Ligand binder design. Structure first.
Ligand SMILES: CCCN1CC[C@@H](COc2ccc([C@@H]3c4ccc(O)cc4CC4(CC4)N3C(=O)c3ccccc3)cc2)C1
Ligand SMILES: CCCN1CC[C@@H](COc2ccc([C@@H]3c4ccc(O)cc4CC4(CC4)N3C(=O)c3ccccc3)cc2)C1
Lengths: 225, 225
């Protein structure tokens, strides 16, 4: 029941920290080990973030876990692409781990190139931080909403779509706040949401190039006392 | 440079025919063979359709092929989900091939269930035929736009986004024509586009469950005299 500006403030405040890779800087420069360790540590902070997305903790624990299980790689990937926006040609996995295309060379450079093209698309659109946090919330709420297994589940899915509608309202409020015409507002909303299809694509490719946090582990981190 | 109503008319006129499965009806009821034969025959009509999507033939042949190669399974899948909308619990692969969940039983029922849930989502939204043809055009133009390999390619990608923006305008015109408020218009536009992320998901799962028309075959059907 919050306002658009309140939605944005809460989302901005909820942002996870930017973690560092744990490689010893004084030692020679093991890549996938570093990327898995980073992803492992970000997951914990991504659970704290998800619980702060307005409306998320109103869901059942089982539904929170399902949404996180479907979305976690997309959320890591959109965060990467956002961090990398102002580093053309490179991916800022961490402030001490900025890699270019050649450092990603089996099947890794393909996904690398996809992430770079997304970061470039974000650059050309001049994606704003307020828009980014809205998009990341949309991913959390949307990526698992069509794969649920009851009266309660109907209530849950209705709640999810009401929260999504509120983020849509917030995105349009941001573009209206900045002077875009009503035509430009619809167009940018559509351009931003179609990028989410590409992030899903890269997530599936990445899930494939990784063959992952278990349901039980997600539930254990989400089932707090 | 057409109007919204002209856009819709052209898209509706371009719709491919609904093909039949070639199984002999007088003989006992071979499933994947029937589904592959159907998909094979629909591809030819999907090329004719793509050339009628306003703006598509303005692209280079190489770019048309790339867009079709990335999108073809999503286009078959959204067509299926649209045909199946008014057959809850079943998938209308063809008018003589309406199958339920049990007939899809390795790894086939998973995708089956995903298609059914999309068809149900379309049902609940009361997706209109004018909206469907717009969405199918968006898929054609969007699914391969972030995976292109020049000054010409910059021109192509700018053209693609202008055509996408025009379909966004058309979708909003349809919802405004029907009396939705400006708030409801943005919300439904967003709901429709987020379903496209799920169609991409199912396409990747299906590409996986199929491991496909070659670049050369697509080029041969698209490179007409
Ligand atoms: C018990 C839990 C099971 N584990 C818990 C970790 C889990 C391993 O998944 C992993 C492993 C690696 C990653 C990184 C990573 C790290 C941080 C980031 O912010 C973003 C990313 C993005 C990313 C997805 C492309 N990546 C890669 O390496 C990559 C690969 C090929 C091409 C380019 C990049 C992400 C997730 C399985
Ligand atoms: C030289 C060219 C190479 N070939 C040219 C054909 C190409 C085979 O790909 C195929 C094979 C089958 C299909 C169908 C099909 C048919 C018609 C339709 O309208 C829609 C669909 C959807 C669909 C995607 C889920 N499907 C399945 O079976 C299915 C599988 C598991 C669960 C549920 C459904 C689609 C494409 C490879």
């Amino acid at each position: 029941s919050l306002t658009a500006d309140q939605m944005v403030s809460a989302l901005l405040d909820a942002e996870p920290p930017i973690l560092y890779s744990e490689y010893d800087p004084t030692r020679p420069f093991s890549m996938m080990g570093l990327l898995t360790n980073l992803a492992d540590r970000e997951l914990v902070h991504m659970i704290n973030w998800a619980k702060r997305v307005p409306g998320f903790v109103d869901l059942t624990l089982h539904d929170q876990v399902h949404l996180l299980e479907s979305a976690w790689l997309e959320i890591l990937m959109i965060g990467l692409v956002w961090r990398s926006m102002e580093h053309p040609g490179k991916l800022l996995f961490a402030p001490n781990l900025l890699l270019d295309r050649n450092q990603g060379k089996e099947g890794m450079v393909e996904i690398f190139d996809m992430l770079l093209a997304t970061s470039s698309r974000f650059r050309m659109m001049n994606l704003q931080g307020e828009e980014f946090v809205c998009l990341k919330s949309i991913i959390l709420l949307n990526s698992g909403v069509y794969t649920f297994l009851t009266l309660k589940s109907l209530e849950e899915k209705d709640h999810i779509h009401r929260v999504l509608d509120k983020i849509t309202d917030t995105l349009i409020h941001l573009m209206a706040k900045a002077g875009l015409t009503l035509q430009q507002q619809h167009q940018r909303l559509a351009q931003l949401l179609l990028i989410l299809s590409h992030i899903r694509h890269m997530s599936n490719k990445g899930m494939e190039h990784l063959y992952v946090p278990s349901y039980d582990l997600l539930l254990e981190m989400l089932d707090a006392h």
